[PDB]
Amino acid sequence: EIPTKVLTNTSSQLKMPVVGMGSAPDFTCKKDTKDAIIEAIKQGYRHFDTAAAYGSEQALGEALKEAIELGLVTRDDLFVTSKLWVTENHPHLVIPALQKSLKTLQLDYLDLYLIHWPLSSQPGKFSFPIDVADLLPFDVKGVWESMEESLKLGLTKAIGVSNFSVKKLENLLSVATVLPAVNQVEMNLAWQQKKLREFCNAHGIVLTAFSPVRKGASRGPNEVMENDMLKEIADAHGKSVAQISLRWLYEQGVTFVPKSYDKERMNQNLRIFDWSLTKEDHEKIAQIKQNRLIPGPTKPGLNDLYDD
């Protein structure tokens, strides 16, 4: 069985499958999203991660709906996460945005809803990347109050954030009634987020790693897949570097949402629970040179976005 992790900051101690299926745009992918999700469900996947900005909510929803109709799974068995985009990251636009995501997904409620970025921009139109001139002041307190309201309305079972630094989390905590249940940030062998991870643990905030395999080969040379030391570790275990990566993340106590629409690869991402890394493996991995893969959604980039 796929392990779950309790979302400490939720009153009901919701259980989130430690590994989930991602759905962000894959530059080199022409696979059928809906068909891929159905296959994932048949394989054991129950945790699905999406966002209004991915363009995948529609297909994901069609897949869940069909899967439920065919009796492959029940809504209660699923854990669905979506996110509030930067353009709607304004106090009074939060609920409408969540209602729109729910309509698109053909769902009555989300298991988790996250503020996608600690940024706000011109409302009413999705534009990517975001032109810095279209940015607007982000009212954290006001937006979070609306996320909290979403819980009371039952539109989502839990609320959290994404791409929030320790500094920004500290600010959020100072004005939050309901503490964020999750913080989804980039986390892979080349970007371990040690400090952030410790802070989150100290505050009951569960971490979810996005781009856990640094987007595979969709963006050219993969720093992790090309790491000789990692290749040796994988070779020693008779596993792939991707598997070594996901196992490490699991052992670090975080959750992760690798995206794979390949029947074989998506299954390999689940086969990480009957074996483990060695003390030496951890010592080696702790030595990997760090490099952040995802800079931010704006053009140009914001050098202080992650407060680091």
Specify binding-site residues for NADP(+): 23, 26, 49, 83, 162-163, 211, 213, 215, 259, 265, 269
**Shortest spacing between CB 268 and ligand NAP, in angstroms:** 5
Beta strands in 7-59, from DSSP E residues, in sequence order:
15-17, 47-49
Residue bearing tokens 């869940």 = 64
Instruction: Please tell me the count of residues contacting ligand NAP according to CB under 6 A.
Output: 32
Rounded distance, CA 233 to CA 93, Å?
Answer: 48
**Structure-token pair, residue 100:** 């729109």
Write down the residue that tokens 């309901």 correspond to. 178
Q: Is 222 in the site for ligand NAP (CB under 6 A)?
A: no
Residue 51 interacts with ligand NAP (CB under 6 A): yes or no: yes
Instruction: Tell me whether residue 71 or residue 281 sits nearer to ligand NAP (CB atom).
Output: 281
Among 218, 276, 278, 291, the residue binding ligand NAP under the rule CB under 6 A is 218
- The DSSP call for residue 21 is B
Quickly count: other Cβ atoms within 10 Å of residue 124's Cβ: 7
Q: Can you name the residues that pair with 48 across neighbouring β-strands?
A: 21, 80
Helix (H) or strand (E) holding 81: strand 79-84
Select from 95-103, 130-138, 253-261, 276-284 the region that touches ligand NAP (CB under 6 A). Answer: 253-261
CA-to-CA separations, 199 to 54, 131, 173, 190, 281, in angstroms, rounded: 28, 32, 12, 19, 24
Q: Rule CB under 6 A: which of 54-113 touch ligand NAP?
A: none
Least distance to ligand NAP from the beta carbon of 219, Å? 9
* Positions in 278-297 near ligand NAP (CB under 6 A): 294
Of 113, 164, 210, 250, the one binding ligand NAP by CB under 6 A: 210
Please indicate whether residue 250 is annotated as part of the active site.
Answer: no
> Binding ligand NAP by CB under 6 A: which of 269, 270, 296, 306?
269
Q: What is the spatial distance between Cα 10 and Cα 307, in angstroms, rounded to a whole number?
A: 27
Q: Cβ 253 to ligand NAP, closest distance in Å?
A: 19
Terminal C-alpha separation, the chain:
38
- Residue from 181, 260, 272, 296 in contact with ligand NAP (CB under 6 A): 260
What are the structure tokens assigned to 230, written together? 């990692």
Of 15, 65, 265, 292, the residue at the interface with ligand NAP (CB under 6 A) is 265
Establish if 118 lies at the interface with ligand NAP (CB under 6 A): no
Output the CA torsion 237→239→242→247 (10° steps). Answer: -50
Q: Residue 267, interface with ligand NAP (CB under 6 A)?
A: no
The answer to whether 122 and 87 have CB atoms below 8 angstroms apart is: yes
**Is 183 among the residues that bind ligand NAP (CB under 6 A)?**
no
For 31, the token pair is 């696979």
Binding mask 1-30 for ligand NAP (x = CB under 6 A): ---------------------xxx-x-xx-
- Are the C-beta atoms of residues 250 and 18 closer than 8 Å to each other? yes
Name the catalytic one among 54, 113, 261, 306: 54
229 — phi, psi (to 5°)?
Answer: -60, -40
List the binding residues for substrate: 116
Instruction: Tell me which residues are annotated as active site.
Output: 54
By the criterion CB under 6 A, which residues form the site for ligand NAP? 22-24, 26, 28-29, 49, 51, 116, 162-163, 184, 210-216, 218, 240, 242, 257-262, 265, 268-269, 294
